[PDB]
């Protein structure tokens, strides 16, 4: 139990809180990053406030902010709700909101993931078909079993190699 107290704040990886180039030249970053800055800025202003000299009121004042901040990344809203500047009165997704949230992690960890070798079309009765089988559009089959086909193309004269067999069907 001495660990419940925080003095070392783990920071989530970078690529998981991207900074990205969009349309026109727009950019986009995981809300987490504005919160992180919150903390780092405060934590630094703190250090410098101690060093410069320290009038009590101001040091606590900051320590308060600091605390608040440390909440923010962990979980937002339990105590007040942080906002990106005037544009969206939106709770910056807190690490918590990431795990649980409206449409969070464990949550959507069970809502669904997208399969790689999938497909979907309209269905239509297949009277002669036997329970055993099902009618599948070749055109669909091709994409579905693309890699299985590629290689099989090479086993026959249709194509010299994979990349070939690929362009052959592009």
């Amino acid at each position: 139990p001495e660990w419940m107290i925080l003095e070392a704040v783990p920071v989530l990886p970078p690529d998981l809180r991207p900074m990205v180039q969009v349309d026109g030249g727009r950019f986009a970053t995981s809300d987490l990053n504005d919160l992180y800055r919150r903390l780092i800025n405060r934590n630094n202003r703190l250090k410098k406030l101690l060093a410069q000299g320290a009038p009590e009121i101001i040091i606590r004042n900051e320590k308060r902010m600091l605390q608040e901040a440390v909440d923010a990344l962990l979980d937002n809203g339990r105590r007040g709700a942080p906002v990106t500047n005037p544009g969206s009165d939106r709770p910056l997704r807190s690490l918590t909101d990431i795990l649980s949230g409206k449409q969070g992690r464990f949550r959507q960890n069970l809502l669904g993931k997208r399969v790689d070798y999938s497909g979907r079309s309209v269905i239509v009765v297949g009277p002669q078909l036997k329970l055993h089988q099902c009618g599948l559009p070749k055109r669909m089959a091709l994409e579905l079993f693309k890699p299985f086909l590629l290689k099989k193309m090479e086993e026959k004269g249709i194509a010299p190699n994979v990349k070939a067999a690929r362009r052959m069907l592009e």
């Binding site: 009121i57 606590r60 004042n61 308060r64 902010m65 608040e68 007040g80």
Partner: peptide, 12 residues
């Protein structure tokens, strides 16, 4: 409770 008030009160 709410942070502005408290500091304001604090130094004021």
């Amino acid at each position: 409770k709410i942070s502005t008030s408290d500091p304001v009160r604090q130094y004021l």
